[PDB]
Amino acid sequence: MDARAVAKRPRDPADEDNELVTALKAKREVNTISVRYLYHADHQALTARFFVPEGLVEFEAQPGALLIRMETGCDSPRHLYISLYLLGIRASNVSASTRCLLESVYTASAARAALQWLDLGPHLLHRRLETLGCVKTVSLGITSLLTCVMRGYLYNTLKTEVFALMIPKDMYLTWEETRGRLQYVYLIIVYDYDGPETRPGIYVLTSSIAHWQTLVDVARGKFARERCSFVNRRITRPRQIPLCTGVIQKLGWCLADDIHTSFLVHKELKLSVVRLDNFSVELGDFREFV
């Protein structure tokens, strides 16, 4: 170590020639493969590749769909990858007309299998779900390939276009009149304990609050009826041991001015969505509240 070594500012990652160019220059050998520029070499987002059967890929052809991993309770597929739209079928929050529309969209054996597996078991819904991230690609086929980011912005190969996050309009939720400049977005699953069986509500919440306790206090204010239902079931129906009235999972952050309303088209049917233009994913785990 010496003074000049300390003074020297670090090398620019962009002005050093890459390893392949280094080797070719060292031997002074030509190659057919273009090598001077490496694509995705400066993508800071972390991505993964997922295989999914043809029946499940609908409304996820467009980039920006939220991707969930669901448990089948079986050893043959073990896990399936489904979108928030498919969960729209099961959620009580979604209206009748939209439910009919996106139920007519998912008329495939795989989607119906997913629904049967979801309703079959005795567990609560959130125990069967694991969130992966947002998708931005599609290669269609009998088995389709989806690439999903799990930490970062949504953009194509050259960053020449940034993708948004699409939320169906019935699931979108806000609790403040004037938005804070920075918004955090959360996934909420809340259970209503009626007589026969629990009806789950599914929401995506955009909020300025980052503290857990304040956020959960606001949520308990907004969902008082479901807490009353939880206590009522605890009283009337012993030997049923419910847990939780709802769970909250954090996934992402975006600016308030990026929020917009839009529609999605698939097989000449229009679904209306809320659109988070420059959304960047940052996943948390399910935290439960009562």
Partner: protein, 294 residues
């Protein structure tokens, strides 16, 4: 059209427009480098001889990877082209039924005409299912190959200077099959097989956008190839163009290389087996297929 006599309906003049589109089929293959390779590629610990050995090893590793991947890309291009050709190529009974019924109709098919077509399909499918197993007569297989060559239609572009021999009578087609079948045919029809040197293009042709094409691509999302020739012919009044944009994109230099050809009735075609491409690879040769009968 032909002038008709009295009492018959006259044939009105008609013009037909068709257009053909291109299809895309990208290929890919990965190669991997270890972090140990990457660190020793660009680091020198005290410069001892062992460190030099490790640097040399990292360099040779990445070089081997690059060469292997380039060879794989060449093989993959061949594989993709062969798959496309097989996708568009119909079987023998279809094409021979078509050639035998070429003058049958001058319109969309009747019930009766397509019934005859179906009968021909069934008969020829049963008669020629496994050619070399049911016969090895020299004349019969020669006629069968001649029919296969004759049935195919001509291409709309023809560069007369390429794929020609010192015998310069021109080559017209290529016939490809597995090594075993080619061996059987060559031993059976050796009186027609010859060894030849053929002049083939040494490099790919180059297609370049003109600045007019750049402007139209920006403004209208479309390019018309050979824009200036179109504009000059259109303004001068000449109705015909001397050449095609794709044809004039062809390479100029051509190299000689050796291959076998067969004569099929004043028609010479090339014979090749692709055993080299799939010698030790994971992919199956797409000319080795399974067939189902019920």
């Amino acid at each position: 059209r032909v002038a008709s006599g009295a009492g018959l309906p006259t044939s009105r003049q008609t013009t037909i427009m068709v257009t053909k589109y291109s299809e895309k089929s990208p290929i890919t293959i990965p190669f991997e480098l270890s972090a140990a390779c990457l660190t020793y590629l660009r680091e020198t610990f005290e410069g001892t001889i062992l460190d030099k050995i490790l640097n040399v090893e990292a360099m040779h590793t990445v070089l081997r990877a690059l060469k292997n991947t380039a060879d794989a890309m060449e093989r993959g291009l061949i594989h993709s082209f062969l798959q496309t050709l097989l996708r568009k190529a119909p079987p023998y009974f279809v094409v021979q039924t078509l050639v035998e019924n070429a003058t049958l109709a001058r319109q969309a098919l009747n019930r009766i005409q397509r019934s005859n077509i179906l009968q021909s399909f069934k008969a020829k499918m049963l008669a020629t299912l496994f050619l070399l197993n049911r016969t090895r007569d020299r004349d019969y297989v020669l006629k069968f190959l001649t029919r296969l060559a004759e049935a195919a239609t001509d291409s709309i572009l023809d560069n007369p200077t390429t794929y020609t021999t010192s015998s310069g009578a021109k080559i017209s087609g290529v016939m490809v099959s597995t090594a075993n079948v080619m061996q059987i045919i060559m031993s059976l029809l050796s009186s027609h097989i010859t060894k030849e040197t053929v002049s083939a293009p040494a490099t790919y042709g180059n297609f370049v956008l003109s600045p007019e094409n750049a402007v139209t691509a920006i403004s209208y999302h479309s390019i018309l190839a050979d824009f200036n020739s179109y504009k000059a012919h259109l303004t001068s009044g000449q109705p015909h163009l001397p050449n095609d944009s794709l044809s004039q994109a062809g390479a100029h230099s051509l190299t000689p290389l050796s291959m076998d050809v067969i004569r099929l009735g004043e028609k010479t075609v090339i014979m090749e087996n692709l055993r080299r491409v799939y010698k030790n690879t994971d992919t199956k040769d797409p000319l080795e297929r399974n067939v189902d009968l019920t």
